[PDB]
Amino acid sequence: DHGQSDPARPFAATANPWASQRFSYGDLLYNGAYHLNGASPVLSPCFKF
Amino acid sequence: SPVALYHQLKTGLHPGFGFTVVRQDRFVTENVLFSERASEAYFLGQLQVARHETGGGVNFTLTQPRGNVDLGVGYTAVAATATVRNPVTDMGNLPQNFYLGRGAPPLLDNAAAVYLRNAVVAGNRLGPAQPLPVFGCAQVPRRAGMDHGQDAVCEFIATPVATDINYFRRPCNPRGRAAGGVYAGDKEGDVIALMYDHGQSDPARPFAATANPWASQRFSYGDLLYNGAYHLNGASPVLSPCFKFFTAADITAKHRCLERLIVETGSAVSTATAASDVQFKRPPGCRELVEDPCGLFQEAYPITCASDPALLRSARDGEAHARETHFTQYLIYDASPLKGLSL
Amino acid sequence: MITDCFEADIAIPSGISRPDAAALQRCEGRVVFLPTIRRQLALADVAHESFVSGGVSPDTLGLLLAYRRRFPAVITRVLPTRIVACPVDLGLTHAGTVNLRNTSPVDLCNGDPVSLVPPVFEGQATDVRLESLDLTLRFPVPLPTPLAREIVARLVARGIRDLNDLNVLYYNGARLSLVADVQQLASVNTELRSLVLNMVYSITEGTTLILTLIPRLLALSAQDGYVNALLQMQSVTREAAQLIHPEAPMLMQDGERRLPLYEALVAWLAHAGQLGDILALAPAVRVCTFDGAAVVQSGDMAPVIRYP
Amino acid sequence: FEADIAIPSGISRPDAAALQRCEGRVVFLPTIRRQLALADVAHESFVSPDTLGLLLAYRRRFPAVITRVLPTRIVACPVDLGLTHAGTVNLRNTSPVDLCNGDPVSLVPPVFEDVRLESLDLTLRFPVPLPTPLAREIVARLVARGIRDLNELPDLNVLYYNGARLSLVALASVNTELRSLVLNMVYSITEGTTLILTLIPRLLALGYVNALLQMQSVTREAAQLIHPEAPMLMRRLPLYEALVAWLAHAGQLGDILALAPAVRVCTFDGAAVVQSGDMAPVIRYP
Amino acid sequence: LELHPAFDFFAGVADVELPGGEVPPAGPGAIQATWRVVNGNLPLALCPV
Amino acid sequence: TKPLPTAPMAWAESSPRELAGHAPLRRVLRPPIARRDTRATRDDTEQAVDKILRGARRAGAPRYHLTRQVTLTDLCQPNAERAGALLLALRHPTDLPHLARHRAPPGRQTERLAEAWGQLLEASALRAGLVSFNFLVAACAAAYDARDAAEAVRAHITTNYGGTRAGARLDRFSECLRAMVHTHVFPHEVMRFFGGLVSWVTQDELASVTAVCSGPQEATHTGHPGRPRSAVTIPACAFVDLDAELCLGGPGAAFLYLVFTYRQCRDQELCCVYVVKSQLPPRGLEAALERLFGRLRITNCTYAAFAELGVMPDDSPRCLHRTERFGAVGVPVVILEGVVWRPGGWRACA
Amino acid sequence: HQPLIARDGPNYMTKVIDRRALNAAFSLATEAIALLTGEALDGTGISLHRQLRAIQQLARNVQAVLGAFERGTADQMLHVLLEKAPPLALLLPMQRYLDNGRLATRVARATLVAELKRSFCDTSFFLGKAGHRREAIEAWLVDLTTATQPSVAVPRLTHADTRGRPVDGVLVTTAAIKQRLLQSFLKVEDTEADVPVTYGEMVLNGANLVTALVMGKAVRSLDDVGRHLLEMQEEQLEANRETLDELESAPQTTRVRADLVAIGDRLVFLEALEKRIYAATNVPYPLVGAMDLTFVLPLGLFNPAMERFAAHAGDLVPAPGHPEPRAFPPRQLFFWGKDHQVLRLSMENAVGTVCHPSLMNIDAAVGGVNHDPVEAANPYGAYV
Amino acid sequence: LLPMQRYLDNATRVARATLVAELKRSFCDTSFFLGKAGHRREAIEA
Amino acid sequence: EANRETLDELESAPQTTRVRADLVAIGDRLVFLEALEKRIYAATNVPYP
């Protein structure tokens, strides 16, 4: 929800638009749901974020 | 003009104002007592069983009338404040809205008014989600999640640019002219004579009448926003910190005896509630007991603050390492109770 | 005694002067507006400082409007340490009979329902003030329901004059007048909205049949002295026939299965006769003196039996 | 608590037998009082009032249920007090309507059709213990009956409750018995609808008050206004003074036609529907 | 409506192929997407002058 | 039997005031006013005779008004539902086809209510009965806000109620309810409160249900000597507070209400039955109905109808929100505690 | 009795008794009434073994109720003393002022309010600030102990050591501090102390009133009034004489485990209660308090003339060829948020206090200034 | 823990929040210890 | 009796012997200070947990 503040730093909604928001650029890559890189055995560190 | 500004502020201009921001905070300390061979006489009564009936069954409720007498002449017991735990209120920046409040006559154009409001309340950490209920109080939006603790509510007292900063490097009074029965003399009109009489000179800094021509004087732009008298913000729940400074009827009401005033800032009742989400004028049911230095002294305390990050970074090294003022910039270095805690 | 009585106990504080404490011993038959039905309350929740909103204590016409958000209760006995009141709605006493006290200037009768009204009368607004505590107790006035509807009616009509005398009454040959007072417009708005929604909904298609009968009434008021007295000297319908020629439409939509006037009465009763209950509060109390008399005078107590 | 009503002497054999019949029947009395005369109960104590006069009387008098009848005195438990004291007191139907369980029951004056004692030389009329959903209906049908005689339908004279049929016709004496209510129910409406009609175009006071009114008047009230003001019109008219005169009068008729329930039937180990002529266990207490 | 670095998401006019004519219909909208081409198309708030 | 926590143990026996009150009256004196200046049984049944004497040598304790009714088992099932549910009496349905001919507005199908009710009699048979409250929730389940727990109500009704095709009883009675509001015969004009369940008697096609028409709940001797206790249970879709939705968090006795919501549209008419817990006056309740349910106001005469149901006498009233078992079905059930039943009458619309 | 010293050259105290009431709720359930009453009983042991289960449920609850009262007192005291207790930082100025001057010259009243503010600001939280040092804190404890003037009451018995030395008072802290002090800053010079047991009683000299039923009127019957008086006043002494005979009789002192610390010249019970009492209840340990401070941050003000400068030449230099954001009038702030964030607070947050239509409500002022009739000045620019 | 135990003895929405701050900074600091205060002594003993 | 002799408590003491291990006194209590990687986990390829 970017109509709201950020529990961490409330005065802004997010630090990036390109990452936070659903269907952002990031979430398209790194959501385990979209199951993009699931083939490669190499760890993806940010998978849990 | 309330419209003309919303441009000049948002878009980066500096008009001819400046504000002294004010906010309140709460810190959970750990105290210590002391007492003496007999510092209190304590009378305990006899028990009373009261049988009541309820769908769940019978109830007994026991009572024991008790009483307290303090037979010490003078101060027979002492509390002190040792250390500090987590400060409850986050020390944040949350501006106050007057749209939560209500009771001001709207500017005449129903177009222009609704134009401002929709361009202020919209997207606000604070301002009302729903339109105002005709009775009661507008509710602050619920927040998805919280972190640091409840959020302080700043306030803005518009003040003329020229007043020297060096007023703020020392604990001061937001109103710009001191108040309170503490300083006053013995006459009837004294406790008032201090505040609103600008013939005389400020007891805090006698070489001037006031540091805020706008905020000090009766019927000024200052009083109108913050008083008990004008009930301007009386609608909204959100705690307004400067309330206790400008409210005139409270100061005169207090008594002047110092032997007493000390004790009664030990136990003083909060004007705020930690239990709330953001910060709220306390509900009458719950009471917190809080020690207010600022209850007696009608002062506030400055913080480490700067208009540049650069000039700020030099503060953490200590005091005498801090460059106070670069060209137009400036730094403020706190005098407080918290001075050395490294909190 | 949970169902029979209900001892809601208003506690009395420690510091009260003996002239102020003995001033509460004359607070026997009163009405206390309990916010909830807690068994332990304080005077601050009873006194007028509980009634006040943020910065605003409302006028007498608004002083009704949070009585009905609360629970009226009658003081049973004033102990030195506490004041005990049974709520009216739950249960009256063991036997179910509590005593009030006429703070009215008006004498009561047996069996008449008794409505309680804020102190609106002149020379009457007597609030027992605690000087030792800075608390006021605005004790309402128990009144007969043929007055207590008119007294609300004079106040509601006074606020609508003030959107463009009236404060004088009579009762059994006793002239009496209430306090002329400026009214907050916020209080009048909920009243005027409560009139019209009960007035618009009280109109049905069958009422146009009744409207046709207006010149029959003035044809009847010239012969029956009962009708000649019923309308008024200053009635509207006597003036609303010399400029008005009413008529009914010929046919009704599905006029075979439905009743025109029977639907007109039920919608009238549910909104127009119901309307006095919505302005004031309900008279849930009548007086049944068992052996005393038929007329209960002012200042005296009166036995109370609950009223459906 | 149980009061007493002494029968004065000089009673024939059927006049004691007729009072033996009305065992569980309802009686109005002036005050809760121990000793009481039978002339206070009878129809002579009311003077002959109309339907309007009886309803004003039945609010002021105190209803009581006759319990077991002694030959010397009538013992009657008052409804408001001794029934909150005693557990459950029986009550005989004199209604044609059969009572179900759980029905709140009010009383109606005997408009339909009355024990007369000759040796004591008095009549006894009695209320009719019928349920409160019917009670506001049987009145409103008869008020609608009297208006048509001031110039009906083949229906409106037949009522259905619990599979049972009634006939309110079953007449001109009843119509003059009810003529004063017709003269008040007509006038309280004709005064009412005009004050609605002569105020909303007079003020329509604006901002959101008239706008929410007009939102309610969007072809609903203003169409009803323009339909009535077509056969109507639009010095000083006493508009504000007539509202007090109207709210006092029209507020009074809601009190009279309220017909509050006193009887609440909680049958136990018995029939859930009590027939006509039978006795029903009655409480007014939780 | 800023979800991705390389695209723009705006409110279009749904159910309109284009170029359609002088005065597009008042019909409802749907978020569309186009490809930013070069850098400068980045919003000034996100690449300050 | 005389323990030694005596001042409480004698206090629970019904005191010293009754001893001292009879002391100045009866224990002293000649004053009031005087002159001036056979192996196992017997003694098993023989002490039971003495237990009757123990029942006779002696005898707080609240009162009741128990009610019974011979009740057909078509709509409600007192065996499937446990003791401690709400119940609802009805008018007799022969008044239904005639009142719909006069109360329905012109232009509406008055034949619809007599037809929909007639289809129900042929669907539960594959006579003023009783509607249980849980059965009513699955009927109005297609109008709620929380629709999944309404299906949890529908999950156990189709498996635990006695009869054939219980879902066909539901979807026909819900069609009856859509015929109620359409013919303007409102369901509050038909549904009458009948007291909370304590026990029932089983028989073929009918059951003899006992209930408290007025009084408290938990101290009725249920018949089971191990547990004469049965809490009041309500499904989660109908339980509505006004202490949380209006920020009234103070202690005090909490009232219990029934509330109908009416939506009057062309063949899409909603019904919702809610149990409203409040600290409010019943006259100070209609304004609270205006604040919440204004959505059904516009789509429609009032949209709401309500009556009293009972009172919780607790200072801080205690509620539960659990998942109990009706057979094998877990239903989110709001269990209420300590309810003192006092009924009342409905309030009007037209 | 005030000391009075004879100088060359040319008293009762009445205090109001506070009054309070403490509560507990004991409630049972219907299930167990039948058993205790005796009603549900049978001959079966099972019926019986169901009692004992519900007899013990009183013993458990009764005790846990009666217990809540001894913890009630121990609660109240801490809640009381906090309300007798001026904070230290505000005292030490006072005790210097009352002892020496105790004088009404406005300057004296004035010179405190200087000393109060600055004492308070500095010494408020001491162990947090100077805690690392030692000879300080050893002198801080000694201030607590000497800040209170002894009280009037002399008790019948006196808490004492094993040796019998008396005990002058009680420190009460949290446990977090107590552990700290007992390592470095103190020594525990006793373990078991002697404490009185019996409560007190009162001696009754009352107003003795009679209402005496009387049959017949004669002198003897009347003299009985005078007689019944003496009878009644004879009774009080017999009542009182027992109490003194009881207070001398009962056992008096027992042995108790508690810490006795020698601070300075005086032995002191050093105790931290959060375990005995406040452990495992919903009640907070009252000794953990609160603070309210209020801070003042300026936004857009502007430096004076003398104070616009630079500490050096090339001090803060923008990249060559670029403007200096330093030299502009500043519209922002920066300060440290709670957790060590750099917050930012700038003009644009003021909107909520300014853009509001309120700032154009003048009408209080115009009326408020014109109460007093104002003269007519030169009206050169006020007139068109 | 050391932060938790302090919290378990008081449960608003706020109290929960400061715990989080309390835990983080207490973890980011006292996590490994003898590598940090290892040279000191009074700190380890405590 | 509310409290009793706890049935758990009526067993007589077992046979105690003498064993070499280190008792450190921390604070007010005694504690075994113990390290097991010799007694156990020695020459057995299980890791030390």
UniProtKB/TrEMBL annotation, chain B:
<feature type="disulfide bond">
    <location>
        <begin position="257"/>
        <end position="286"/>
    </location>
</feature>
<protein>
    <submittedName>
        <fullName>Major capsid protein</fullName>
    </submittedName>
</protein>
UniProtKB/TrEMBL annotation, chain F:
<keyword id="KW-0946">Virion</keyword>
<dbReference type="GO" id="GO:0019069">
    <property type="term" value="P:viral capsid assembly"/>
</dbReference>
<dbReference type="InterPro" id="IPR004999">
    <property type="entry name" value="Herpes_1"/>
</dbReference>
<keyword id="KW-1048">Host nucleus</keyword>
<dbReference type="Pfam" id="PF03327">
    <property type="entry name" value="Herpes_VP19C"/>
</dbReference>
<protein>
    <submittedName>
        <fullName>Capsid triplex subunit 1</fullName>
    </submittedName>
</protein>
<feature type="disulfide bond">
    <location>
        <begin position="140"/>
        <end position="271"/>
    </location>
</feature>
<keyword id="KW-0167">Capsid protein</keyword>
<feature type="region of interest" description="Disordered">
    <location>
        <begin position="1"/>
        <end position="21"/>
    </location>
</feature>
<dbReference type="GO" id="GO:0019028">
    <property type="term" value="C:viral capsid"/>
</dbReference>
<dbReference type="GO" id="GO:0003677">
    <property type="term" value="F:DNA binding"/>
</dbReference>
UniProtKB/TrEMBL annotation, chain H:
<protein>
    <submittedName>
        <fullName>Major capsid protein</fullName>
    </submittedName>
</protein>
